[PDB]
Amino acid sequence: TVWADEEFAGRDFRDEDLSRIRTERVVFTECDFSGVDLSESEHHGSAFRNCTFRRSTIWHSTFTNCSLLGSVFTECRIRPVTFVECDFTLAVLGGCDLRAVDLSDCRLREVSLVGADLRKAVLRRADLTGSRVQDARLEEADLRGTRVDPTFWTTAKVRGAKIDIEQALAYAAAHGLAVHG
Amino acid sequence: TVWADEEFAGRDFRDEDLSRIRTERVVFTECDFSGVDLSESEHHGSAFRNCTFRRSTIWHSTFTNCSLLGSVFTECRIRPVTFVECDFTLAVLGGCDLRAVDLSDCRLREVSLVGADLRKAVLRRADLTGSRVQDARLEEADLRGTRVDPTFWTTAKVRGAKIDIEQALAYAAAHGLAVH
């Protein structure tokens, strides 16, 4: 099954089997995917706007150039997964297991990552500004090139994280050091 | 009173009034300055090696190109004071009040600064390597150009301290960040 160049709104998909579906430039607006099986699905240029993925399974899926704007992923089985240049603006990933997930070059503005596990995640050249990272585990994550709020450095658990020069300067300043030069 | 080009070893100066004395290239070795008034004194190129200044007063003194090697400053009234390019190697300054004191370009290698107060101190281009800074207060100190051990950044209280780029990178690394 392949869905292409079309739009679905307010649809109830609860506990449906959508395993191995392909979408190309499909828009899902306010759809309920609670408990749905999306195992091994594949999405190219598609959009999931304010959709609910509570207790759904999206593992083994591939999303390229997709939007997840405002969608909710509480207790979603995500990993392993492939995200290529995706937009997660305002998505809720609180408490999600994202260990060793690659979100390089992804937009993660104002995302909720409260209590999210991102240990050893690859977050290179991402944008995390406005994100809520209370109790987020970023130990040994690769953050190089990623834009973060100063508050990120005093909120997220970043021991062992790989950072660049600009991030190191920002880390010191966020801890109240007056950095000169 | 002006002493010059003299060496004093194992001298008891306890509770003597040495206020406004001047010394030029005088060596004091294992001299006891406990409870001495050394207020408003002046020292150029003098050495105080393994001397005790316990409970002494040295405030409003000037020390230029002086060595304090291994000397003990416990409960000494130090500040305010002028130190110019002095060497404090292995001195004991535990619990001492050095607030807003200028120790720029001073050697402070393997000094004890345990519980020392250096808030707003000026420590530009100093060397603090090997120093014990457990419970040391460096809030709003100027540390720019100063050499410190990595452990300094996780031991001394440095909120508000002025630091340079290299120090900021070292601060991050000392907190477990992998800086690339």
Curated annotation (Swiss-Prot), chain A:
<comment type="function">
    <text>When present on multicopy plasmids confers increased resistance to fluoroquinolone antibiotics such as ciprofloxacin and sparfloxacin but not the quinolone nalidixic acid. Forms a structure that exhibits size, shape and electrostatic similarity to B-form DNA; it may bind to DNA gyrase which is postulated to protect it from fluoroquinolones.</text>
</comment>
<dbReference type="Pfam" id="PF13599">
    <property type="entry name" value="Pentapeptide_4"/>
</dbReference>
<feature type="domain" description="Pentapeptide repeat">
    <location>
        <begin position="106"/>
        <end position="145"/>
    </location>
</feature>
<keyword id="KW-0046">Antibiotic resistance</keyword>
<dbReference type="InterPro" id="IPR001646">
    <property type="entry name" value="5peptide_repeat"/>
</dbReference>
<comment type="subunit">
    <text>Homodimer. Probably interacts with DNA gyrase.</text>
</comment>
<dbReference type="GO" id="GO:0046677">
    <property type="term" value="P:response to antibiotic"/>
</dbReference>
<protein>
    <recommendedName>
        <fullName>Pentapeptide repeat protein MfpA</fullName>
    </recommendedName>
</protein>
<dbReference type="InterPro" id="IPR051082">
    <property type="entry name" value="Pentapeptide-BTB/POZ_domain"/>
</dbReference>
<comment type="similarity">
    <text>Belongs to the pentapeptide repeat protein family.</text>
</comment>
UniProtKB/Swiss-Prot annotation, chain B:
<protein>
    <recommendedName>
        <fullName>Pentapeptide repeat protein MfpA</fullName>
    </recommendedName>
</protein>
<dbReference type="InterPro" id="IPR001646">
    <property type="entry name" value="5peptide_repeat"/>
</dbReference>
<comment type="function">
    <text>When present on multicopy plasmids confers increased resistance to fluoroquinolone antibiotics such as ciprofloxacin and sparfloxacin but not the quinolone nalidixic acid. Forms a structure that exhibits size, shape and electrostatic similarity to B-form DNA; it may bind to DNA gyrase which is postulated to protect it from fluoroquinolones.</text>
</comment>
<dbReference type="InterPro" id="IPR051082">
    <property type="entry name" value="Pentapeptide-BTB/POZ_domain"/>
</dbReference>
<comment type="subunit">
    <text>Homodimer. Probably interacts with DNA gyrase.</text>
</comment>
<comment type="similarity">
    <text>Belongs to the pentapeptide repeat protein family.</text>
</comment>
<feature type="domain" description="Pentapeptide repeat">
    <location>
        <begin position="106"/>
        <end position="145"/>
    </location>
</feature>
<keyword id="KW-0046">Antibiotic resistance</keyword>
<dbReference type="Pfam" id="PF13599">
    <property type="entry name" value="Pentapeptide_4"/>
</dbReference>
<dbReference type="GO" id="GO:0046677">
    <property type="term" value="P:response to antibiotic"/>
</dbReference>
